[PDB]
Design a binder for this molecule. Structure first.
Ligand SMILES: CCOC(=O)Nc1cccnc1
Ligand SMILES: CCOC(=O)Nc1cccnc1
Lengths: 237, 300
């Protein structure tokens, strides 16, 4: 069934699984028309599919041309999401296909269930967690490859950089979620935190800075502070 | 006019004949039902006084043979049987009629209810949904499950209704996943109506045959089948105009006849609110919507 705090460690066992998040597939700017009406201009977006055990991120990029001449785009976007995940699995060798796909929004379950009728042995599951994956477009290198795309394509990343060399996937996932929660709650402060010290750089083949173990502890604590803070500023506590 | 004689009534029982029913007391001198209108299929059903568990009953067509009821004290129920000796049957019926030991099928002359509930129900198809080929009549009870329920356990005693599943390869064409899931016209018109049923009358017959088993026996899998077949039509953007007109008429009479106190377990809130208020055919069931809103506004 659904995934929550009580079965949180299933994510790190040895059954292949993927999270799918569709919060950034259909993105628009809203603006005024010369006639004083309102209209949307779509911008590029992406389907965020992540293996939580390995860190592998299949960033399957949505160029704006896919919306051309289409109606009911919010609904189409959940089906577009479902269609591009299903062809990814189809392409993938059988021993690499996921045994479970966990959607971050319940509206994806039916679109994905229908697109995967051919895979009756892949479990499609919801989750009770409030995962911060929408903040993935606050990672500069991901935002950049999405906005530069001139056609629909898929770029592959490891969202954990090299972290699994030193920490377990449970700990890697917790860092990632704390980073993303921070970026989601206050992007500026979150980003100011990450890049204040110009001696710590982001390798060309990485998304995040090259922190030592001790520097990550400082960083992680600062990100908690921020999340505590913004929570007070938001509720006056 | 035809007759279903009873050998006797050894146990107290509520007897149903179509939409009518009457109480018979233990060993009351009851010898059956007369004046049954030829031309329609009928159902004669039973609820024992001592154990309301298990409503059961028999679907039959008097044109297909001479049928009687005889209590069987081993198996403990009223069983339908066929008398093949026709002279023996007429003689038996005539005696019971002369001694006036039969209740009269009580049809009001203004009343087309039964015809409107069975218009497309066909007895020959009933034998195939309820497989028991040595008998011309078909037994059904509360507890019988459907073929599809047995997929999610005795297959000889099941209801082989038409399998409808909206999230199935049969229902969804490769490459039209979203189109076919949001607008079921392909599944209704090509897969079901053109491929399985052959025509809308065969389709209306199962919907009517689903509903009657739900209403008369509280058969859950039959209720599920009625609602599925309604939903497949309401959720199709393209339905022949005559099917929508007839559907409205079919449902109107089914809702009219439902016992007022049974709406809470026989009617699915999600299917009805979807069909009447959200679906492609929301503006196409005027009669059915007017009666639902005046009689079960709570469900909606
Ligand atoms: C929105 C972009 O979609 C993809 O790039 N999809 C895809 C399809 C098949 C295999 N791998 C990826
Ligand atoms: C499935 C093909 O259609 C039917 O068999 N209809 C039906 C079933 C039972 C009673 N009357 C009609």
């Amino acid at each position: 069934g659904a995934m929550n705090s009580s079965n949180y460690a299933e994510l790190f066992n040895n059954d292949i699984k993927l999270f799918v998040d569709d919060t950034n597939v259909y993105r628009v700017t809203v603006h005024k028309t010369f006639e004083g009406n309102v209209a949307t201009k779509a911008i590029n977006g992406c389907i965020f599919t992540l293996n939580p055990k390995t860190g592998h991120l299949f960033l399957k990029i949505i160029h704006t041309s896919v919306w051309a001449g289409q109606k009911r785009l919010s609904q189409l976007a959940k089906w577009k999401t479902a269609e591009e995940v299903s062809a990814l699995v189809r392409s993938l060798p059988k021993e690499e296909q996921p045994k479970q796909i966990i959607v971050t929004r319940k509206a994806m379950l039916d679109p994905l269930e229908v697109h995967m009728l051919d895979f009756p042995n892949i479990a499609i599951r919801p989750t009770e967690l409030r995962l911060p994956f929408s903040a993935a477009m606050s990672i500069d290198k991901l935002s950049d490859v999405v906005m530069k795309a001139t056609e629909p394509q898929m770029v592959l990343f490891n969202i954990y950089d090299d972290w699994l060399d030193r920490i377990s996937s449970y700990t890697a996932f917790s860092r990632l979620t704390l980073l993303l929660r921070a970026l989601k709650t206050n992007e500026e402060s979150a980003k100011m935190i990450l890049l204040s010290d110009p001696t710590i750089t982001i390798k060309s083949y990485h998304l995040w800075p090259s922190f030592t173990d001790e520097q990550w502890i400082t960083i992680e604590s600062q990100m908690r502070d921020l999340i505590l803070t913004e929570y007070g500023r938001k509720y006056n506590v | 006019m035809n007759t279903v004689p009873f050998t006797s009534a050894p146990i107290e029982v509520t007897i149903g004949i179509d939409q009518y029913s009457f109480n018979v007391k233990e060993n009351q001198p009851f010898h059956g039902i007369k004046d049954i209108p030829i031309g329609h299929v009928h159902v004669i059903h039973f609820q024992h006084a001592d154990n309301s568990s298990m409503r059961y009953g028999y679907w039959f067509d008097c044109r297909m043979g001479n049928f009687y009821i005889q209590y069987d004290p081993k198996d403990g129920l009223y069983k339908m049987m066929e008398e093949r000796d026709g002279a023996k049957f007429e003689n038996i019926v005539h005696n019971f009629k002369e001694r006036q030991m039969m209740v009269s099928y009580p049809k009001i002359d203004e009343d087309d209810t039964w015809y409107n509930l069975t218009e497309f129900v066909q007895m020959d198809k009933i034998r195939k949904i309820v497989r028991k080929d040595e008998n011309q009549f078909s037994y059904v009870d509360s507890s019988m499950t459907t073929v599809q329920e047995n997929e999610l356990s005795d297959p000889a005693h099941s209801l082989n209704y038409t399998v409808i599943n909206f999230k199935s390869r049969e229902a969804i064409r490769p490459g039209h996943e979203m189109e076919d899931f949001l607008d079921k016209s392909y599944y209704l018109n090509t897969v079901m109506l053109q491929g399985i049923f052959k025509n809308s009358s065969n389709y209306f017959g199962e919907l009517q045959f689903a509903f009657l088993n739900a209403m008369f026996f509280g058969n859950y899998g039959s209720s599920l089948q009625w609602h599925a077949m309604i939903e497949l039509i309401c959720s199709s953007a393209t339905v022949p105009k005559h099917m929508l007109d007839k559907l409205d008429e079919i449902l109107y009479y089914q809702i009219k006849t439902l016992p007022e106190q049974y709406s809470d377990i026989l009617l699915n809130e999600r299917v009805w609110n979807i069909c009447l208020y959200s679906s492609f055919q929301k503006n196409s069931l005027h009669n059915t919507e007017k009666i639902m809103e005046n009689k079960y506004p709570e469900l909606l």
